[PDB]
Amino acid sequence: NVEKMSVAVTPQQAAVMREAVEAGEYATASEIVREAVRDWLAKRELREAEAERLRKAWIEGLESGPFAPFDIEDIKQKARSRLVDAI
Amino acid sequence: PIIRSPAAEGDLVDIWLAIANDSPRAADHFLDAIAERILQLAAFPESGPRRPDIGADARALTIGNYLILYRLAEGWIEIVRIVHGARDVST
């Protein structure tokens, strides 16, 4: 299997875990904790990925060649030229 | 004056094409909405709060769920990027 770390549940938490296992929602209190940590990691993994994405996007824009005046209508027109070629 | 990076233009065309799959018209409305939001920076340069988590002197102006990543220079505004915002915890 894998490595082990010992965790200390609070009185109110032990009570709620007990009902869940009894109701059959979970086989054991240890599996419920395993779910809780996995959910937390997913959240952290996502947040870290998104924060890193934006950090890289910024340096990417700065390094993406030289700036040009802003005209939206040119962009709106340029996009259509690629749509027609798609068909 | 307002200048944009080659990446930022690529963002808006990508954004436009995505919406254009559903309706080309709707894509025009959203990009128009983005522009109106960028042009507000000429009168209100600090509408977007500083975003040190993204870049040293980066700022971010919110349009929909997308961010207008920009920087302020002497005499002009530099539009760096337009990326989707940090995604919510909803999984």
Author numbering:
A (entry chain a): 3 to 89
B (entry chain A): 2 to 92
What text appears in the publication on this structure?
Although our model for the toxin and toxin-binding region of the antitoxin (residues 43–89) were an excellent fit to the electron density, noisy electron density for the N-terminal portion of the antitoxin prevented adequate refinement of the entire structure. To produce a second model for the ParD2-ParE2 interface, we initially pursued truncated versions of ParD2 in complex with ParE2 but could not obtain crystals. Importantly, both structural and coevolutionary data suggest that there are no contacts between ParE2 and residues 1–45 of the antitoxin, and the modified structure was indistinguishable from the original structure in the overlapping regions. The ParD2*-ParE2 structure reveals a similar hydrophobic binding pocket to ParD3-ParE3 surrounding W60 and involving toxin residues A62, L73, and V91. Unlike ParD3 D61, which forms a salt bridge with R59 in ParE3, ParD2 I61 does not form a salt bridge. Substitutions of ParD3 residue 61 do not improve binding to ParE2, likely because ParE2 G59 provides flexibility to this region and space to accommodate almost any residue. ParD2 residue 64, which corresponds to the second library position, is leucine, and interacts hydrophobically with W60 (distance = 4.2 Å). Unlike ParD3 K64, which interacts with two glutamate residues, ParD2 L64 does not contact the toxin. Instead, ParE2 E89 forms an intra-chain salt bridge with R75. On α-helix-3 in ParD2*-ParE2, K80 forms a salt bridge with E12, analogous to the salt bridge formed by ParD3-ParE3 with E80-K12.
